[PDB]
Amino acid sequence: LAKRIDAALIMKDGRVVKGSNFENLRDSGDPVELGKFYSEIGIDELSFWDITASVEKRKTMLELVEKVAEQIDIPFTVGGGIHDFETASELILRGADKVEINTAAVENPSLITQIAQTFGSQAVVVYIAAKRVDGEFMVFTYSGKKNTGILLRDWVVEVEKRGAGEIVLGSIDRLGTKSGYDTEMIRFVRPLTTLPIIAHRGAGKMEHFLEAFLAGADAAKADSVFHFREIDVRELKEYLKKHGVNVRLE
């Protein structure tokens, strides 16, 4: 099974929030330059997540997408408060390959179908933030602030039915930790969907990526562990290939 390594970049006002430790870059906080560098060292796909204030947010995200599409030749997603079809459409047309949606999809699951009808399922990534509550995996919205009362098991099935292309499974039980991806959650979700599962939250060392792939993840996404250079991307790819994981190098 081919496996993918993804890097996520959190952005505000056109800048990478908290930057990165790559001293070789002209501007280690420029999301375009940082994303281009990642694409040259072994990242397979990029995610750009925007948290800009509402008044400049739409134009900021559109300008980001346009610049990234010109400079980078790997697929990328954009996300962060994409609430309706028109917003998703303008970002895809401006250059993004995929949009990543969460709270708006939970509140209006037909948004998944509406985007997929024009852009295909492959353009729709649903990010599912989940946490254990009273012994059950529950779906959370609004950056983890709201327990929806929807079971993870039910939402995964609905997301596929509505036409999503990929699911990013983010474990709130691992946010800020470096103890590993939530492999129990990945194993819980794996039999429920045919879609690619992207693990998110908890990665602290290269072996954690191996564990996530053994759990059934098709891709593993991380952020600060790469930006602060706790894990080197090329070392990670060499490690995974050494231990039998079908990852891409050259």
Residue numbers in the entry: 2 to 251
Recite the paper's sentences.
Computational design of KE07 involved construction of a theozyme to catalyze the chemical reaction, which was then grafted into the scaffold of imidazole glycerol phosphate synthase (HisF) from Thermotoga maritima. Catalytically essential residues from the initial design include a base (Glu101) that facilitates C−H bond cleavage, an H-bond donor (Lys222) to stabilize the phenoxide intermediate, and a π-stacking residue (Trp50), which was designed to stabilize the transition state and favor substrate binding through interactions with the aromatic ring of the substrate.
The Val12Met and Phe77Ile mutations, also in the second shell, cause changes to internal cavities that cause a slight rotation in the backbone at Trp50 that also favors the alternative configuration. To the solution sampling of these states, we used HREX-MD simulations, which are among the most comprehensive computational methods to investigate conformational sampling. These results were consistent with the crystallography and kinetic analysis: whereas in R1 (original design), configuration A was the dominant substate that was sampled, by R5 we observe increased sampling of configurations B and C. By R7 and R7-2, configuration C (which was the only state we saw associated with product in the crystal structures) becomes the dominant substate sampled, with configurations A and B sampled only rarely. These simulations also reveal that the mobility of Glu101 was reduced as a result of the hydrogen bond formed to the indole nitrogen of Trp50 in R5; this could account for the improved pre-exponential factor from R5 onwards.
